[PDB]
């Protein structure tokens, strides 16, 4: 919140107060929290009616330090998911000179909620045991038309991990994020196309066209009409089956049953099959492309401009070949001939409306010839082309309906919301800041600096070094959970369940799915993530070069622990453990925004720990820096990516060191802190250098002692900002010597990105659009960093710390409002009771059927011999169930 | 755990504390949680790859004694089951010159858990008493499909013994592990293909192909199409029957009944049948071969390459011939013609898909001609060829079906986990270490030394001496229980039950079986087993020559009792009595890992006891040693296979003498122990010889008294490691004269095996991959062994024991261990604010782990 | 509504008029279908046939009103000369029949 | 708040009498189906009066 | 195919005067539908009555698709107390009524 008087900044909460862990439960951050402030919309409304094409800026009056008032000043939204692939130069569209951004994931099995066999599987085992008294081969009922021997094999040897569903739901949310772009322009912000290319102006008159494998440069059309994997460079295989017996022996252990709860629609069922095939294979299967009509700043030149979505570049390794087992239409003997097999399909697979070339060409609408016993030749298709043909037909409303049918088998609300959080964390991206004196700056068009970019975590994104397909693989950026086919098979049929797998009474998905407003919201959810990470890095004074080398440094020992505990590299009792200091950022988010991040569970010996997206990053990336006006790098600062008005205008509570400078009000303007706060001024041998009041330990260190670093003090950081915010500071040593790190040209600070204005807008003035809170303190070689003024330049600021004088600073002219976290149809009121009881019954539906053990017992030869009597089912202990105990 | 500081090694537990009995029940230590220690690992240069093909290795940053940092250095996983039969030399595959490894086993009988009669049997014998079974008709049969006269005559047997299922399930699991190699190349880590042949690179493009009797050299083919058993040669015999009346005399006592439950176990009843037959006959029947495409280290010379699985060579059982009684689907009198017998059966037995030659050739899919009461001739098939036919069709998913069916019929949980333990203990295998001053070393290509290998038990494995079929004098390794046919038949037909015969759900079958990761998990389970043995052979200083001769040729009484008590002995009935000191090794396992080994029932005279794989080895073996470069045998050391980092980084707790050195250049860097604790130095300055602070002598200063050996003292062993880790140690006696044992070339210590690097990886530096903990103290002659330095070389280390100096050694920068600056400008002790913010949430984890 | 519209209300609307599957694969009856049944019984004072159904071991009924599948196409009308017109809500029969 | 566009997540309410008045306007000879501004709707319409 | 066999009770066979007709009716009742396309032919004439002729219609019931059981086995009652047949003539004589 913005301070109105110095009394408000002086009474702001300390940083340690906000990093305490909190116990209360909290609602999710939906992004409407920002929408109420930066837009007209007050209640639910048609996105097309609202023209949210023009709702993409912070706006407001600004006050200058000289006493003039600027009206209709603006600041751009920092994030976007679009990477320009053609760029404007000299008012003419031209191709990109820079290689594309890429992301890599770590994917592994981990323990989840403990799992248990259902009543129905106890039924199946009873059927086998009662059969054993006979000469007859029919062991058990064949569930949902699948072969009874297959139910017999699926119902055996369960894993103790539990099941996750995370990678699946990620692939589905990445694709939803990509197709969301395809709606009309009135519902997408202009700013999203010009976060990187600030010289282009998108036209409102046509919707953007999403396509596949089209890019002009660097071999980014991964085969074109003859598709191959963007990373592997190969091609997959996909084969369909009625029974497991036809699956080749080399890969019968990898097969996946396709549940018939999906495919229940009158239409779009073959499409549902293609989509389910997409959610369990490797991603990306192709490079998607957004194409939008755009024009020059004058609106003269016009053309189709090419963009690559970030979601289409992030790699999630999975299976390349796969085998799906289609539901049977009626219980029957397995087919021995082709016609018997084709006639027997519930949904018969076919190619989508888009022809492909190469070996095994696919015609649009082409049907598959089912595999069967005694078949002369095994049949299969390349998978990259099968996913290619349907790729242009997927859209948001169908993914919503699919996901809604999926909802009725298993819980998918929280899991999807978590995978969506991960989507937003890996996809929204901002360009690096430029230093300046004034309010705006940008790098040269079609330059390496223009396109260099960063995560909400202040880490730079790696680039490709060669033409697609990529011969080699980048270090992983983040670790996600995998979904095992075996336990998937057990759960899809009702043989097993766990607390995270329970169907939910809503029978419905998160609000973000199926909306045309989704891109705007995802763009707005990245903001809090950066606010929390920047508070994390700016609470301490380490410079970007020192982070950049911290992991291996042996100059200091504390810097190493500091780097090492910010990432996830610990495990215990077979499962993943969250980064030890990511919990601090998680704590900060809750205390500052009064909301709760989405989390998954991990079981450690049976105890549940929560893991948010903050705790799962991996070491190896480079930290964000800022460039000079000429494009030279600047190392001296703490990492930064966004201007601090975003931090301080969208919080309920903020640490004291980061607050805004208060408005002029008659005599009183700005104020500092002195020896009455326990601070002290630093002087050296040189009489023409002065540094502010600082912590008392600062007098007795020029190098930090090994095993120790700079402390949290909010007031000293405050005076550090007051010194920097004068236009003439020196970033120096205890003795007044130059530090090893590169420093900006004098008096400059990093500032936010420039975008073209609308009529009536003004550019931001002075330091009203700049990071300020990045006060350096820890040099790479272990020296302290000081901010010096000359004596004459020193007098007014020191008296201002003494509160005898006043400093003059610019501010936004804005008030504080932070909203509370917060529909029945007539038909819903008509049916509310029946919905209330049926929803309650579905929660226990599990593998349940009305028949009890007491009925089935009457049908048995011997009740005592039944495995259900001698082994009643229990939840599995972790990591392993007891085996061969000492009697 | 590795040590970040010397306070961590002062506070480590004593060996005696860890050898102490613990009473609580503990969980099994599966490879599914051992897996995560290799993945999820500190280090920033690491490209954290997902494929299990690449998660094959121990990666990490390292720190030199000179203060330099090394990124992403590598240590290989020591074990494998594959044995190369083609060897690359000169960048090309070349036929191997070395003979195949072999394993052998002895049977025992199982009096534990004697059976209890069902009500059914008791009423049948009751009817035999009140009648003469005269009520029954010629054609009466049960629903199962056997006639009543047979069940009645089987009922009449009285058995002392319980039922075991062990040898059965063991054969099933060995075959499982062989078939588990057939999955795609991404699913098996490549390090497994190059533990022996380290000049070879497996290709990720194609799956390994599993065949049989295709070996290049040494008669390995086993006669090809006509299959003869690899041990002893000759064919077996197999026959099928609807009644036991038709089985020939002198074989009637040995017949097995096949329950319909075996036949309905899988979609193809013939496959389930052959699987049962293989399960209850002698193993191996043939030699399976794994073929994998490989390429040159430069990638220049690709080709197919042959490997022989270790499971394929273990020898178990002896039942060359058998008779199977099969259910009749109709209620009929016993057959008199051939066609009646054919029509009569529940499913007629058939040959498998792959045809074979011989005096009795079998066409593919050929149908057996059933036996009947008229006997123009008895009819029969060769058994090795009958199994050669079905050998290709066995598959891990179907085995998962089969195990589920067995679990329903009788509980398979406990028994299968124990059998799996024996499978790991017998098949997993590591090469003997070579000595070096530096980080990496290996023996010459296609050398005999390249192929010497050992168990997790640190016993060297036997090698074949002649071409197959073998006619060897047997050299067995361990005892196993056998499954008895009559006790089988009493249970298959409802005539008896036991306490361990409780039926189970199919869901409870252990998750390893039928899973494609299992091979990988196998290797992992070998690592903790060794650690335990390693801590047993190191706490005492006995050298490898002394272990080679204690049982066969040494006049010292103490070694004799020592080698004698480490192994098991027979009872008057012939039952096992478990190894006395083996109980110590079990204890170690449970204190270092907080996990338990499988337990198996045993009896002495009618007294319950248990047995683990730790207590069932046979006395009379040869021990692990190491090779100098150029391959000369050296045997001064106590036996060793694996590097210290493996022992140190997987344990929850280790004894004090085995802790890792702290990083160089810190306050509280490596140190030693002195008089105040209780030690005393030996000096010999008249000859330039100084030795560390050691244990006070007890009339055993130069020769040990007959009937006594060196005492357990953790701190002297530690000081001996300090003297050793210095560059030029010298192993001499009390006078400073040469010991009888062969010694390493000066300065050398045994070190881990070399493997080819991935790009971006580094070879380990210094003694970071060395084994250090094996310090000699007791020689074959009975004299003490001393580690000496010269009077000048010995001056700093004495000051470090005396704690007035620090020493410098290399380390791994893992798991909370950080680098030390050369200055050390200490400040006031200061808890960091982030550590106080996160203290509780951190302790919660430890508590959750403590629960488990 | 079921295949291509970004309005949430039509989506829930077309969704609730039809039946959905249970984890076992059993029918869960259409939620708004119960309204249509009610209409039938108030306009005619006669009942449609009822059939037993279960959710987890809980009794329920089903009529032909609640067992249609989502994803269909609807009734429209033709101009003379046969051009499609679709401004109206769907219709087949004249008011006198309803009345 | 649904005078020209319905809010996302809401639709027209059940009101019998307005539907009645709409039938009255329709049963007159030349009804015209347009929007709030009096502009053409996207749906195809009957030839006038039909 | 042993797992899928249906037993035909004698009650189906004594259902009608011709047991084969009742048998075929049971078989049609438990196999896949339709097996064939029935056709209704009716004489018709012109609106002036000028042009009479036969005219073909296809019933809507004939085109609905239900079931999937292409193949089946029927177990039939034995009218005599006998052991299972070994020859053809024994099996023919044995049955309650031969199909």
Residue numbers in the entry:
A (entry chain B): 789 to 1610, 1618 to 1682
B (entry chain A): 789 to 1640
C (entry chain A): 1338 to 1436
D (entry chain A): 1487 to 1536
E (entry chain A): 1039 to 1137
What are the paper's exact sentences on this?
The final two three-dimensional (3-D) maps were resolved at 2.79 Å (full particles with genome) and 3.40 Å (empty particles without genome), respectively, based on the Fourier shell correlation (FSC) 0.143 criterion. The current resolution of the map for the full particle allows us to build ab initio atomic models of the MCPs. In each asymmetric unit, MCP-A and MCP-B share a similar tertiary structure, and the overall structures of these two subunits are well aligned with each other, showing a root mean square deviation (RMSD) of 0.66 Å for 728 Cα atom pairs. Each MCP-A is located close to the five-fold vertex, while MCP-B fills the vicinity of the three-fold axis. The ab initio models revealed that the first residue of the N-terminus of both MCP-A and MCP-B was clearly located at Pro789, which provides strong evidence for cleavage at CM-1 between residues Asn788 and Pro789 in OmRV. The C-terminal residues 1641–1685 of MCP-A are disordered. The MCP-B C-terminal residues 1618–1682 form a Ω-like arm structure composed of four loops and three α-helices. It extends along the interface between MCP A-B-A and interacts extensively with two neighbouring MCP-As. However, in OmRV-LZ, the C-terminus of MCP-B, instead of N-terminus, play roles in stabilizing the capsid.
Recently, several unassigned viruses isolated from mosquitoes, including the Omono River virus (OmRV), were identified as totivirus-like viruses, with features similar to those of the Totiviridae family. Here, we identified a new strain of OmRV and determined high-resolution structures for this virus using single-particle cryo-electron microscopy. Generally, members of Totiviridae and totivirus-like viruses have a non-segmented double-stranded RNA (dsRNA) genome containing two large overlapping open reading frames (ORFs), namely, ORF1 and ORF2, which encode the major capsid protein (MCP) and RNA-dependent RNA polymerase (RdRP), respectively. Similar to that of other members of Totiviridae, OmRV-LZ has a major capsid with icosahedral symmetry and a T = 1 lattice comprising 60 dimers composed of MCP-A and MCP-B. The central cross-sectional view of the map with the genome shows at least five visible layers of viral genome RNA packaged inside the capsid.
